[PDB]
Design a binder for these strands. Structure first.
Ligand SMILES: [Mn+2]
Ligand SMILES: [Mn+2]
Ligand SMILES: [Mn+2]
Ligand SMILES: [Mn+2]
Ligand code: NA
Length: 344
DNA sequence: CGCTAGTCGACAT
DNA sequence: TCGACTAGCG
């Protein structure tokens, strides 16, 4: 959701081929592939007609990784995150709008236009993802459903040393503190890598290459958890953090118009939103696959009360988190759609 | 120049 | 699940 982030830090990126990670473990932001896969068969998906074309699309990529001796872990988005509800609403509204329009264009005969609308009405469901999971597993590929956003789960797997890199199209994964992200990776393995440790290569960040400041910059520029103040993008957010001296980020935001020589009113709820968004990048719940439990992405500090962090994912019993992670529990019916047992 | 909001692009015949 | 582009605005 950090619009314009990749161009802005392009200096820190390197063209690569995934051969680099041969014999290592890479995690995949699989909903990216799913959304790409679904475009080919949008019409049938919109009409409710049966399709599994998207499964073969994802499997091309999976197969390619395996051929180069990469051990992929496919990660899937799970339950809805309240911090993202506004964005979830606008996406839902847009899908609905386009689906209706396509249908009306079918009673018109304009199949060309109707196709353009359907393709923008695509909704990726757990049922669709679960078909990819079965395909993957049958080829011995580890799959994991995040309890909430795949984003934080990926970050967690990268930070824990479980995977060495993350394949995704979402550059905001860097604000979650991923070490290595591989973007724009094509079907042949060519892609664009950004390492957190090379963010200092990026001249226009100044000293906003440190984890905490980089996160603040991303949030300030406007992210999925929190719309920016009007007139603030990456460059001005970066500028505020460069020029600001005070460590207390709240006191800096309150006087943000000062650092920028702009008339910017900062509403009281914006500070609250900013804190919430910060806490969401930091403490969004993930599933530790080794101990098989729900944990915050980072350990709680001595400044956060975990009781107040519902918006970052509510805890559920670990036995339930397990069934979700294995893909057994449908997200929504919360009923068993499968009974895969990794032990046996 | 930097930011915004709208648009449109991803598939693959 | 997202990103790239662009014309217009300050
Ligand atoms: Mn849940
Ligand atoms: Mn979703
Ligand atoms: Mn994201
Ligand atoms: Mn995501
Ligand atoms: Na912004």
């Amino acid at each position: 959701g950090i619009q314009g982030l990749l161009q802005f830090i392009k200096e820190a990126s390197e063209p690569i081929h995934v051969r680099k990670y041969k014999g290592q473990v890479v995690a995949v932001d699989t909903y990216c592939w799913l959304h790409k896969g679904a475009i080919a068969c949008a019409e049938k998906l919109a009409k409710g007609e049966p399709t599994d074309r998207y499964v073969g699309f994802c499997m091309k990529f999976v197969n390619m990784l395996l051929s180069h001796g990469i051990k992929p872990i496919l990660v899937f988005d799970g339950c809805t995150l309240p911090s993202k509800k506004e964005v979830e609403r606008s996406r839902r509204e847009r899908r609905q709008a386009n689906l209706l329009k396509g249908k009306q264009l079918l009673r018109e005969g304009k199949v060309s236009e109707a196709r353009e609308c359907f393709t923008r009405s695509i909704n990726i469901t757990h049922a669709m993802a679960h078909k990819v999971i079965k395909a993957a597993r049958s080829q011995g590929v580890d799959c994991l459903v995040a309890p909430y956003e795949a984003d934080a789960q990926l970050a967690y797997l990268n930070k824990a040393g479980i995977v060495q890199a993350i394949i995704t199209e979402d550059s905001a994964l860097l604000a979650f503190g991923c070490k290595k992200v591989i973007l724009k990776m094509d079907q042949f393995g060519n892609g664009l890598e950004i390492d957190q440790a090379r963010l200092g290569m990026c001249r226009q960040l100044g000293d906003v290459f440190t984890e905490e400041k980089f996160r603040y910059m991303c949030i300030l520029s406007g992210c999925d958890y929190l719309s920016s103040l009007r007139g603030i993008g990456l460059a001005k957010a970066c500028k505020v953090l460069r020029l600001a001296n005070n460590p207390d980020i709240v006191k800096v935001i309150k006087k943000i118009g000062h650092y920028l020589k702009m008339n910017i009113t900062v509403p009281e709820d914006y500070i609250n939103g900013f804190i919430r968004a910060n806490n969401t990048f930091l403490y969004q719940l993930v599933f530790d696959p080794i101990k098989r439990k729900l944990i915050p992405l980072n350990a709680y500090e001595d400044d956060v009360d975990p009781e107040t962090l519902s918006y970052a994912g509510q805890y559920v019993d670990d036995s339930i988190a397990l069934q979700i992670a294995l893909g057994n529990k449908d997200i929504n019916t919360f009923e068993q759609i499968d009974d895969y047992n990794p032990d046996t």
